[PDB]
Amino acid sequence: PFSVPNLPLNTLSNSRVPSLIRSMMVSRDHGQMVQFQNGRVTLDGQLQGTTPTSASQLCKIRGSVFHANGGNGYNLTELDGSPYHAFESPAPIGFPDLGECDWHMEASPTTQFDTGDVIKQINVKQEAAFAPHLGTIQADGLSDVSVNTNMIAKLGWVSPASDGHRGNVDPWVIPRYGSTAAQLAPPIYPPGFGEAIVFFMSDFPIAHGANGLSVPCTIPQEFVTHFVNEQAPTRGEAALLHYLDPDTHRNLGEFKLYPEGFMTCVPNSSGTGPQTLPINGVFVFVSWVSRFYQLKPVGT
Amino acid sequence: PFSVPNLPLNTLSNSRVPSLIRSMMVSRDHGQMVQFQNGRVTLDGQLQGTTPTSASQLCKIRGSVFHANGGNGYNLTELDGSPYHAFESPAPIGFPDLGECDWHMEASPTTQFDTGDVIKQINVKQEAAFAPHLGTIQADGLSDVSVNTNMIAKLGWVSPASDGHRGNVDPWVIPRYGSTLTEAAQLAPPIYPPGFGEAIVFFMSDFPIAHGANGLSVPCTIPQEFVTHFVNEQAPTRGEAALLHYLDPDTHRNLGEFKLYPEGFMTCVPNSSGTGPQTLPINGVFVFVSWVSRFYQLKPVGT
Ligand SMILES: OC[C@H]1O[C@H](O[C@@H]2[C@@H](O)[C@H](O)O[C@H](CO)[C@@H]2O)[C@H](O)[C@@H](O)[C@H]1O
Numbered sequence: 001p002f003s004v005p006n007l008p009l010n011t012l013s014n015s016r017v018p019s020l021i022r023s024m025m026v027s028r029d030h031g032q033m034v035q036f037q038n039g040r041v042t043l044d045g046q047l048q049g050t051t052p053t054s055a056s057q058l059c060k061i062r063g064s065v066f067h068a069n070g071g072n073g074y075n076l077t078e079l080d081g082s083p084y085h086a087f088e089s090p091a092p093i094g095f096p097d098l099g100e101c102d103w104h105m106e107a108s109p110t111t112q113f114d115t116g117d118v119i120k121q122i123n124v125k126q127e128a129a130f131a132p133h134l135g136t137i138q139a140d141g142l143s144d145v146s147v148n149t150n151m152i153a154k155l156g157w158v159s160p161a162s163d164g165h166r167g168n169v170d171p172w173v174i175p176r177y178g179s180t181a182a183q184l185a186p187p188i189y190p191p192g193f194g195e196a197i198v199f200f201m202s203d204f205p206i207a208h209g210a211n212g213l214s215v216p217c218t219i220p221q222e223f224v225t226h227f228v229n230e231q232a233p234t235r236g237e238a239a240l241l242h243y244l245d246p247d248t249h250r251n252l253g254e255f256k257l258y259p260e261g262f263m264t265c266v267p268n269s270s271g272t273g274p275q276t277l278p279i280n281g282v283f284v285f286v287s288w289v290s291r292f293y294q295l296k297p298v299g300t
Numbered sequence: 301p302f303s304v305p306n307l308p309l310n311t312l313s314n315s316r317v318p319s320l321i322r323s324m325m326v327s328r329d330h331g332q333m334v335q336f337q338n339g340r341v342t343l344d345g346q347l348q349g350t351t352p353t354s355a356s357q358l359c360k361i362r363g364s365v366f367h368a369n370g371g372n373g374y375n376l377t378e379l380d381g382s383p384y385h386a387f388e389s390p391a392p393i394g395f396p397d398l399g400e401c402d403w404h405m406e407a408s409p410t411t412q413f414d415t416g417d418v419i420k421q422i423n424v425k426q427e428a429a430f431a432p433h434l435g436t437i438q439a440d441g442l443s444d445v446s447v448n449t450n451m452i453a454k455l456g457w458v459s460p461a462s463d464g465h466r467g468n469v470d471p472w473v474i475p476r477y478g479s480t481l482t483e484a485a486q487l488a489p490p491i492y493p494p495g496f497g498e499a500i501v502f503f504m505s506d507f508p509i510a511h512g513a514n515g516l517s518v519p520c521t522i523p524q525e526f527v528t529h530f531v532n533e534q535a536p537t538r539g540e541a542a543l544l545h546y547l548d549p550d551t552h553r554n555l556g557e558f559k560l561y562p563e564g565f566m567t568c569v570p571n572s573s574g575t576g577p578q579t580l581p582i583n584g585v586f587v588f589v590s591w592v593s594r595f596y597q598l599k600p601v602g603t
Contacts, residue, residue: 212412
């Protein structure tokens, strides 16, 4: 039988950045289509895009340093050191999906070292030499690292594109994985009947973010892990959820979780919808309903 | 009904550092006693020490910058910004438990910013002014940050203690959480091997460690996703130990027997050499078999 975690949202992680859920929101400006590659999972527990099981795999890169004429960078592997297979994902699992911005990362050797001198602040730009699908990315800060040095890089902060084609960091945009083409997790659309996609918002270090520090995702990481663990057969077109008060277990709103692993509500006329709900509530599965089951409006 | 995650180990996180499980081991040198404060949970889902629900809360510090008595640091809060209550727990939830080393962290404001110039490389030393239990730590790299600037710091790497009292980083050692007596601090209790040839199973992950006693390796007593699972399930503990099989999901073979105790740690009986689970593959899955007595004798594991 299908279930969602009985865990308060404010204790759970974003599925695109390793950061606690701070709020829920709907977006009129950005909610018409998203194609996030992290936080992508079916309700019967099939991982999609670059989505890992663990939050500890999120926004990390592993590779061997290459030195090329007018570029240095990484020949990419999976985080565990094993080969990257194109038949599995558009990039190695846990690869960041924050498109069209600079990635400021801390890179360390995957071999035992004595001193912090071998730890490098690197900058990955999304320009011509950004080709994760082809297994190669260019990175600044590697000029003094020996060729074939194996390193793990962890995303620290993001800033506007070095080439200046954008003024801000747009956390709704995914990368262009590179091609000469990647099998992306499919686009998510609001399915009609006044329904808006629910976004789980977390703060991440972003210089000039369109929404300041806020990064949206379509499902908490611990929900991803739960579905992968349970492998519950999908026995309906949508799973009806209640968002409960953690003290009283009283119903604060109705939500539909679709087989494609994203969630919707109908926001109240006023505007905000789930944004006015408290963030220490718990989702509970009620029953399977049709994809045209009409939800009561949520919020003020 | 009690269960453990049906997920391969190599896809799961260490519960002390946010890093994938690379191997299992028993420890002759360190396995007689551990008192890790992260990865601490009962089988019926009670969090202990500083253990968070989420791997994303691990090895993070949140606080407001102070300048006092020629030393700079943080008045600590919980990671969600809510107040840290002193004299109640060893430290805020997710606070690192890597004792007697320097913590090199990246600190960023919890308020929107325009430039990366506000992002600071800080060093937290475990010296006289390291008092997380009292809700205060000192850090190098904060002299140029305005008083009351609210920041989250994320652990990047650790190195030997600046004061030189130790030559390497020992990842088996927990912090001294103030000038308070360890007995008066509200620590998750010590874990002992329970007898009958049983050794504590340690889940090993690589973390960026300069001059580590075990190189990059950090041990923990349970995968983070196991912690979350027990907190979610709240399964009543109906036995003295939970018997597990470690299965190869590809070959359909039982690779070894393990006992998971109510205190949330796992044991095996290692072979004569004492290498035990270290030779097992890391892509296996644990499954709950049944509740057994503390005297239930396990088949030896390894080579
Ligand atoms: O050995 C203690 C200490 O080592 C590093 O500090 C050294 C410093 O002692 C030396 O004089 O200069 C180098 C070059 O930058 C380092 O700053 C670590 O930084 C420190 O955390 C501690 O591990």
